[PDB]
Write a protein that binds this ligand. Structure first.
Ligand code: PRF
Ligand code: PRF
Ligand code: ZN
Ligand code: ZN
Lengths: 372, 372
């Protein structure tokens, strides 16, 4: 396979379906990427993640650089070897997590300095260090280092942040290109910023296209603006990005959000919703999510979802999983997580098929009618 | 297969190897039974438990009667269906846990009354209720309800407890036999008591044989007397039990303890050591246990154990598992537990093979030399 090749096989309105070919494997789009926070997709062996249908997973740079550490992972052979996942891995730049998980952060045009939330160590993340860490991890899809804009944001602040992000996009591109091994085996995605302002989104899109990237992400959304507003911004923002490259909506994972985003041209997604929901006890079903801890499921012999083809729904009852979660058993988390990730992958598969068959619109309608 | 059939294929000194045939499957002896506390073997799917080589698992009656509840499990189809394990399951009588986990216990000749450690509910366990609960769970090997003797124990108290236990053994036998379905499909094991006193162990053994059981367990050991003393008691106690029936040493699981117990005629074992050790971070190896959290393993690329054939040692490094455990990741527990249970099963397999080949003595010697 090539270093990177995105091909669109079918379209319906703004929706697209196709594949991204990379050295470590093929990625079917629209794609949902399970999140592997600390070199592990919570409660699942990599083979199980693959069994659900995942083609690629996401790795958090912020978390990994803190522990076990980027250099350490490199010395151990890279992230793939370390965690046992041999297919593509997309790594975020770490910027977002730094501004929401660490403390005593010091921002400047050079980058950001912060103290770990684990202990009291300091770090100086920048476009160059972020790209370097992603190289050390052996990431397949590298994200440019940006400065995220909090919501709500004033035009002035959003412009300043977006402008700095574009300068950082150029620095990220050059850093990536200067490292022969990385430039020849990995791909680089740029991130569009600009908050909810159309003119800023346009300037960002133009700056990113001018530099040139393998893929373009829509950053700065799903940060508190609500679906209505998010959809409104996607309406004019996605068309601004190069049509022949993947469109990645970062941090978006609610089923309905995904369907709406695909309807607006998005090709890639990632979110902890699936996995985290395996904590409180939320299980996704085509009839909407259910909280398995609820007493009504204590003697329910049916599977989590009546149609789901995952191993969990083939072998265990809601009653059993209900018991497991209420008892705080690890198997409870393992089963809930496997089911939720499988559910998301089945959602993506139904989306890909409907688009390829020119019936995505009807699928979106039918999906919403039953899910709500 | 028959309801119950124990056959000894080979012997070496007091050691024996063979099989127990039951409706749900064949059990190779000496056997180690993973413990499924709350209807789950901590952090493992039943298929994974089977993959390690386990032929049978143990279920805790005390825990199950508290939650989800015996009657509820019965209504849901039995424990096997509930948790997804279709092979034999041995259930303890619950007596031991009641005297070590619950509170405000009230003991009498009728049974014991206690309050759950989960909430403040009350329960009245007795020989009849214990047998009934084990029936409701659908247990294959039912344990008689006894009164365990704390260590150390005076001759007088040990005799009184042993005497009450034998009266309870008779009540357990009659309860079991009165329930046609259970008597025709399950097996009943009696439990020898008597603390560390030879004369009491003899009286207990005689009383149990007089009543007649499918198997005989040596209870009251591994409660603080130390291996030396435990071995001394086993020396004279095991020979007192019927030679043609299985000998079960309850609550014994340290590798060396198992080897020594088999050398003294024990055929079955169970202990949480394997699973619990997957918490603190203790991994078993032929060179002795190691604490994976130790800094020396941070960049160790070797598997947990150099010879182990388990899936964990085939795919992940000590370095990775070290990271997982120190990060509190669920996958850490899953991998450590799978490895430890696999290790125990490999230990049992090496024991069975060496006995069948008349070289168990040499194996015990070689095992100890390297393990210590
Ligand atoms: N939903 C926004 C978001 C999630 N993760 C992100 N990571 C980066 N670098 N930038 C972003 O805007 C985001
Ligand atoms: N190691 C002693 C022991 C563990 N579990 C037990 N359960 C019962 N009923 N009796 C016992 O003596 C024991
Ligand atoms: Zn499912
Ligand atoms: Zn192993």
């Amino acid at each position: 396979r090539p270093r990177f090749s995105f091909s669109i096989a079918a379209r319906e309105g703004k929706a697209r379906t196709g594949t991204i070919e990379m050295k470590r494997g093929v990625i079917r789009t629209p794609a949902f990427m399970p999140v592997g926070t600390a070199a592990t997709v919570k409660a699942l062996k990599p083979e199980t993640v693959r069994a659900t249908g995942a083609d690629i997973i996401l790795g958090n740079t912020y978390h990994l650089m803190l522990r076990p550490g980027a250099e350490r992972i490199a010395k151990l052979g890279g992230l793939h070897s370390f965690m046992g996942w041999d297919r593509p891995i997309l790594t975020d730049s770490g910027g977002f997590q730094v501004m929401s998980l660490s403390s005593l952060t010091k921002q400047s045009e050079e980058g950001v300095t912060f103290k770990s939330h684990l202990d009291g160590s300091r770090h100086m993340l920048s476009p160059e260090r972020s790209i370097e860490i992603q190289h050390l991890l052996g990431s397949d899809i590298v994200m440019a280092f940006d400065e995220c804009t909090p919501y709500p944001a004033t035009p002035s602040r959003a412009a300043s942040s977006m402008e700095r992000s574009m300068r950082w996009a150029k620095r990220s591109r050059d850093a990536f290109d200067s490292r022969k091994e990385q430039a020849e085996n990995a791909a680089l995605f740029g991130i569009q910023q600009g908050s909810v302002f159309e003119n800023l989104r346009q300037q960002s899109a133009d700056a990113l296209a001018e530099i040139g990237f393998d893929g373009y992400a829509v950053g700065g959304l799903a940060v508190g603006e609500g679906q209505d507003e998010m959809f409104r911004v996607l309406d004019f923002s996605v068309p601004m990005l190069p049509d022949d490259k993947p469109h990645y909506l970062m941090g978006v994972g609610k089923p309905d959000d995904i369907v709406g985003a695909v309807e607006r041209g998005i090709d890639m997604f990632d979110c902890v919703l699936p996995t985290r929901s395996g904590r409180n006890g939320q299980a996704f079903t085509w009839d909407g999510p259910i909280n398995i801890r609820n007493a009504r499921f204590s003697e329910d012999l049916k599977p989590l979802d009546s149609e789901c083809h995952c191993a969990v729904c083939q072998k265990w009852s809601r009653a059993y999983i209900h018991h497991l979660i209420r008892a705080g058993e690890i198997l409870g988390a393992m089963l809930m997580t496997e089911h939720n990730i499988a559910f998301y992958q089945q959602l993506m598969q139904k989306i890909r098929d409907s688009i390829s068959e020119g019936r995505f619109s009807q699928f979106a309608q039918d999906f919403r009618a039953r899910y709500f």
